[PDB]
Amino acid sequence: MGDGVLELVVRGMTCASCVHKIESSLTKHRGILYCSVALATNKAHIKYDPEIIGPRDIIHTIESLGFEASLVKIE
Ligand SMILES: [Cu+]
């Protein structure tokens, strides 16, 4: 079994000070099991909990900082 694994692209992550802030901020959600962001890929390997959280929420958070995102893994 496994949680809602959703390695979406996250952009605007201009430095480590973005990356760890995004990480730490997202990890505030109980509706996640993991987040592993990287500005190399421009991504967020979140595992988002699908009872509490939808991708929209993570996006809202990302936006509510100063960042943007897109699910590369559509299909
Ligand atoms: Cu930054």
PDB file of C-alpha atoms and ligand atoms in Angstrom:
ATOM      1  CA  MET A   1       0.000   0.000   0.000  1.00  0.00           C
ATOM      2  CA  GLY A   2       1.171   3.638  -0.277  1.00  0.00           C
ATOM      3  CA  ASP A   3      -0.065   7.229   0.136  1.00  0.00           C
ATOM      4  CA  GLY A   4      -0.985   9.712  -2.651  1.00  0.00           C
ATOM      5  CA  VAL A   5       2.504   9.960  -4.182  1.00  0.00           C
ATOM      6  CA  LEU A   6       2.512  13.043  -6.422  1.00  0.00           C
ATOM      7  CA  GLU A   7       5.914  14.225  -7.652  1.00  0.00           C
ATOM      8  CA  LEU A   8       4.674  17.471  -9.247  1.00  0.00           C
ATOM      9  CA  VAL A   9       6.944  20.212 -10.634  1.00  0.00           C
ATOM     10  CA  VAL A  10       7.191  23.280  -8.341  1.00  0.00           C
ATOM     11  CA  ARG A  11       8.801  26.451  -9.797  1.00  0.00           C
ATOM     12  CA  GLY A  12       9.924  29.773  -8.296  1.00  0.00           C
ATOM     13  CA  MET A  13      12.144  27.785  -5.855  1.00  0.00           C
ATOM     14  CA  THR A  14      15.065  30.124  -6.550  1.00  0.00           C
ATOM     15  CA  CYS A  15      17.357  28.832  -3.728  1.00  0.00           C
ATOM     16  CA  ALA A  16      17.754  26.456  -0.758  1.00  0.00           C
ATOM     17  CA  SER A  17      15.969  29.094   1.365  1.00  0.00           C
ATOM     18  CA  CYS A  18      12.909  28.478  -0.830  1.00  0.00           C
ATOM     19  CA  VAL A  19      13.309  24.677  -0.913  1.00  0.00           C
ATOM     20  CA  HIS A  20      13.561  24.036   2.853  1.00  0.00           C
ATOM     21  CA  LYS A  21      10.856  26.656   3.570  1.00  0.00           C
ATOM     22  CA  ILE A  22       8.459  24.983   1.105  1.00  0.00           C
ATOM     23  CA  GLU A  23       9.365  21.617   2.622  1.00  0.00           C
ATOM     24  CA  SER A  24       8.986  22.649   6.274  1.00  0.00           C
ATOM     25  CA  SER A  25       5.808  24.620   5.488  1.00  0.00           C
ATOM     26  CA  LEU A  26       4.150  21.757   3.596  1.00  0.00           C
ATOM     27  CA  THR A  27       5.164  19.289   6.323  1.00  0.00           C
ATOM     28  CA  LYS A  28       2.926  21.408   8.620  1.00  0.00           C
ATOM     29  CA  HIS A  29      -0.024  19.637   6.927  1.00  0.00           C
ATOM     30  CA  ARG A  30      -1.108  16.403   8.659  1.00  0.00           C
ATOM     31  CA  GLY A  31      -2.507  15.546   5.215  1.00  0.00           C
ATOM     32  CA  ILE A  32       0.951  14.520   3.933  1.00  0.00           C
ATOM     33  CA  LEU A  33       3.248  11.610   4.800  1.00  0.00           C
ATOM     34  CA  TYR A  34       6.365  13.001   3.042  1.00  0.00           C
ATOM     35  CA  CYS A  35       7.709  15.963   1.033  1.00  0.00           C
ATOM     36  CA  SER A  36      11.049  15.962  -0.881  1.00  0.00           C
ATOM     37  CA  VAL A  37      11.506  19.150  -2.929  1.00  0.00           C
ATOM     38  CA  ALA A  38      14.409  20.008  -5.266  1.00  0.00           C
ATOM     39  CA  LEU A  39      15.202  23.114  -7.365  1.00  0.00           C
ATOM     40  CA  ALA A  40      17.400  20.889  -9.582  1.00  0.00           C
ATOM     41  CA  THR A  41      14.321  19.159 -11.026  1.00  0.00           C
ATOM     42  CA  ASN A  42      12.030  22.025  -9.869  1.00  0.00           C
ATOM     43  CA  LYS A  43       9.846  19.479  -8.073  1.00  0.00           C
ATOM     44  CA  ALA A  44       8.097  18.300  -4.921  1.00  0.00           C
ATOM     45  CA  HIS A  45       7.937  14.572  -4.228  1.00  0.00           C
ATOM     46  CA  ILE A  46       5.035  14.938  -1.892  1.00  0.00           C
ATOM     47  CA  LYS A  47       3.123  11.992  -0.614  1.00  0.00           C
ATOM     48  CA  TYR A  48      -0.207  13.734   0.059  1.00  0.00           C
ATOM     49  CA  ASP A  49      -2.907  12.129   2.205  1.00  0.00           C
ATOM     50  CA  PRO A  50      -6.081  11.733   0.072  1.00  0.00           C
ATOM     51  CA  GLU A  51      -8.551  11.756   3.036  1.00  0.00           C
ATOM     52  CA  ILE A  52      -7.422  15.188   4.323  1.00  0.00           C
ATOM     53  CA  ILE A  53      -5.701  16.934   1.398  1.00  0.00           C
ATOM     54  CA  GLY A  54      -6.114  17.312  -2.349  1.00  0.00           C
ATOM     55  CA  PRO A  55      -3.344  18.532  -4.723  1.00  0.00           C
ATOM     56  CA  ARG A  56      -5.250  21.843  -4.861  1.00  0.00           C
ATOM     57  CA  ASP A  57      -4.397  22.427  -1.155  1.00  0.00           C
ATOM     58  CA  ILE A  58      -0.654  21.918  -1.684  1.00  0.00           C
ATOM     59  CA  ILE A  59      -0.926  24.230  -4.712  1.00  0.00           C
ATOM     60  CA  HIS A  60      -2.759  26.850  -2.577  1.00  0.00           C
ATOM     61  CA  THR A  61       0.056  26.591   0.004  1.00  0.00           C
ATOM     62  CA  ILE A  62       2.806  26.845  -2.686  1.00  0.00           C
ATOM     63  CA  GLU A  63       0.998  29.908  -4.135  1.00  0.00           C
ATOM     64  CA  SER A  64       0.409  31.365  -0.641  1.00  0.00           C
ATOM     65  CA  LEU A  65       4.189  31.395  -0.201  1.00  0.00           C
ATOM     66  CA  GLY A  66       5.398  32.793  -3.567  1.00  0.00           C
ATOM     67  CA  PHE A  67       5.689  29.770  -5.884  1.00  0.00           C
ATOM     68  CA  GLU A  68       3.919  27.946  -8.765  1.00  0.00           C
ATOM     69  CA  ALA A  69       3.466  24.232  -9.636  1.00  0.00           C
ATOM     70  CA  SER A  70       2.295  21.711 -12.284  1.00  0.00           C
ATOM     71  CA  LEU A  71       1.730  17.915 -12.159  1.00  0.00           C
ATOM     72  CA  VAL A  72       4.135  16.537 -14.794  1.00  0.00           C
ATOM     73  CA  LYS A  73       2.629  13.087 -14.127  1.00  0.00           C
ATOM     74  CA  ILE A  74      -0.823  13.885 -15.561  1.00  0.00           C
ATOM     75  CA  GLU A  75      -1.688  10.363 -16.820  1.00  0.00           C
TER      76      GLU A  75
HETATM   77 CU    CU B   1      15.009  31.094  -2.547  1.00  0.00          CU
END
